[PDB]
Design a protein around this ligand. Structure first.
Ligand SMILES: NC(=O)c1ccc[n+]([C@@H]2O[C@H](COP(=O)([O-])OP(=O)(O)OC[C@H]3O[C@@H](n4cnc5c(N)ncnc54)[C@H](OP(=O)(O)O)[C@@H]3O)[C@@H](O)[C@H]2O)c1
Ligand SMILES: Nc1nc(=O)c2nc(CNc3ccc(C(=O)N[C@@H](CCC(=O)O)C(=O)O)cc3)cnc2[nH]1
Ligand SMILES: [Ca+2]
Ligand SMILES: [Ca+2]
Length: 159
């Protein structure tokens, strides 16, 4: 199964200048637990935004250009990315905007964090097609002294 995971601020903003201008501890914990032990596919910008291999995951980077690092696996097309992961249960696609766009039609599951933050950003999640999906889990949290925004963790299944 192919799944996307993303955190969205209002208007589906996911990033801005090359970064994500918020610090939300609880959401990275959610990300880490839903991705560990699985292969993660990302685009080259997102690889540069993070800045090291994510531990305990097979890191697969999309780029049209030969790789710049042997600690990860470089691939040049979506089909090659899928093949590289191997016969695993679940493939996690971790962005960014251009990669999410391509993988959306294929994906069966979306792990979305809706963040109540206004944010001026230059990258969005694709607008997805409301009647495709069914929400099968959603849990809201108020801000706290560690997380400055309220947030909701939603998991959607393709109908
Ligand atoms: N909020 C979140 O959950 C979240 C998650 C991930 C990323 N982000 C944010 O998203 C932004 C980055 O997203 P983006 O749209 O800029 O970049 P992206 O999707 O991270 O990276 C795009 C790059 O990936 C490569 N690529 C993508 N599809 C390919 C294909 N089919 N074949 C070959 N190469 C392919 C290309 O690299 P080449 O140019 O090298 O060919 C392209 O330039 C950042 O602001 C980041 O902070 C947010
Ligand atoms: N829900 C969600 N939230 C995000 O922030 C997110 N970010 C990306 C891409 N950006 C990032 C940014 C930082 C780290 C990161 O450093 N995560 C660590 C936590 C700290 C540590 O390394 O121990 C990790 O191990 O996953 C990963 C992906 C992709 N999907 C997401 N999905
Ligand atoms: Ca907005
Ligand atoms: Ca377009």
């Amino acid at each position: 199964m192919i799944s996307l995971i993303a955190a969205l601020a209002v208007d589906r903003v996911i990033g801005m200048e090359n970064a994500m201008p918020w610090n939300l501890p609880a959401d990275l914990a959610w990300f880490k637990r839903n991705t560990l032990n699985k292969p993660v596919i990302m685009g080259r910008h997102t690889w540069e935004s993070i800045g090291r291999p994510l531990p305990g995951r097979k890191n697969i980077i999309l780029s049209s250009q030969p790789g710049t690092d042997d600690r990860v696996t470089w691939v040049k097309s979506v089909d090659e990315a899928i093949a590289a992961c191997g016969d695993v249960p679940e493939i996690m696609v971790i962005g960014g905007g251009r990669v999410y766009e391509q993988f959306l039609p294929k994906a069966q599951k979306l792990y979305l964090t809706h963040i109540d933050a206004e944010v001026e950003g230059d990258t969005h999640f694709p607008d997805y097609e409301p009647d495709d999906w069914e929400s099968v889990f959603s849990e809201f949290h108020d801000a706290d002294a560690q997380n400055s925004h309220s947030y909701c963790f939603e998991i959607l299944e393709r109908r």
